[PDB]
């Protein structure tokens, strides 16, 4: 498995001092993800507050929570044991990218 | 101090290039930024910093991330030239699927 853009994946995180697993939406394409072992992904949070960078997930996908578009981050998907859960529809991906691109100053 | 877009900053310590603007960074305490490294290898997402800028190395455009800059005590180093900022945004935008 190599994550691809639009995949919703489980991703581990582990504390330094003595963690869990959280869903994330992948934005970068498999071509990149497979030659670096990294991906750009946005976390899914259970806390929907109406924050403007939240992107809602349709109920039919089965994934509870909202995507935090402005929390995109480079993460090592091999070390974090990425596991595909679902695939987001094109309009969800477009909303995440539009909001994040606005924040990053993309023209 | 509140980091602004194009600023090169010290962060807990290493340099970074800030992409998000002060109007977001100040209200949230977060920013989107790319790390700077002296280990230029010529790999595809590196962006070279010009000499005598105040900080040396390459920007790793593909390692952009959201982070809390207050807890890392961000401190301004310089301002990136517009062409460096535009090249980082071009490479990262392509990586993020933004065309």
């Amino acid at each position: 498995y190599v994550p691809d853009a639009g995949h919703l994946v489980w991703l581990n995180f582990t504390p330094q001092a003595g963690g869990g697993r959280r869903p994330a939406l992948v934005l970068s394409p498999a071509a990149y993800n497979g030659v670096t072992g990294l991906m750009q992904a946005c976390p899914v949070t259970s806390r929907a507050k109406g924050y403007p960078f939240e992107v809602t997930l349709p109920a039919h996908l089965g994934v509870s929570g909202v995507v935090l578009a402005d929390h995109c981050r480079s993460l090592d998907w091999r070390s974090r044991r990425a596991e595909q859960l679902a695939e987001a529809p094109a309009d969800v991906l477009a909303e995440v990218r539009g909001k994040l691109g606005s924040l990053l100053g993309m023209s | 101090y509140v980091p602004d877009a194009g600023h090169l900053v010290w962060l807990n310590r290493r340099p970074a290039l800030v992409l998000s603007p002060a109007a977001y960074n100040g209200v949230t305490g977060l920013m989107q930024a790319c790390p700077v490294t002296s280990r230029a290898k010529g790999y595809p997402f590196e962006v070279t910093l010009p000499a005598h800028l105040g900080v040396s190395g390459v920007v790793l455009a593909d390692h952009c991330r959201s982070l809390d800059w207050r807890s890392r005590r961000a401190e301004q180093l310089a301002e990136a030239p517009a062409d460096v900022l535009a090249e980082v945004r071009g490479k990262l935008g392509s990586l993020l699927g933004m065309s």
Binding site: G19, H71 | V27, G29
Partner: peptide, 30 residues
């Protein structure tokens, strides 16, 4: 998406803190 329109909708109550991804893993630079 206009950034100013987005930022105008932020409030102290709807802010999210930094997402915790734990320790640095693998090929992560930071």
């Amino acid at each position: 998406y206009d950034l100013a329109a987005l930022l105008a909708e932020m409030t102290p109550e709807n802010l999210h803190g930094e997402t915790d991804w734990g320790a640095l893993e693998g090929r992560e630079e930071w």
